[PDB]
């Protein structure tokens, strides 16, 4: 869509990159409790 839905992409990605980085977290940790 960079050459052309919303305006502000980022703010999914943000919202996703949030989710990536909270599941990383929730893996490691459950992996080695």
């Given at each position: ?6 305006s ?20 490691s ?5």
């Amino acid at each position: 869509s960079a050459l052309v839905d919303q305006s502000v992409y980022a703010m999914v990605f943000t919202l996703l990159c949030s989710l990536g980085i909270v599941l990383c977290l929730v893996t490691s940790v459950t992996v080695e409790w």
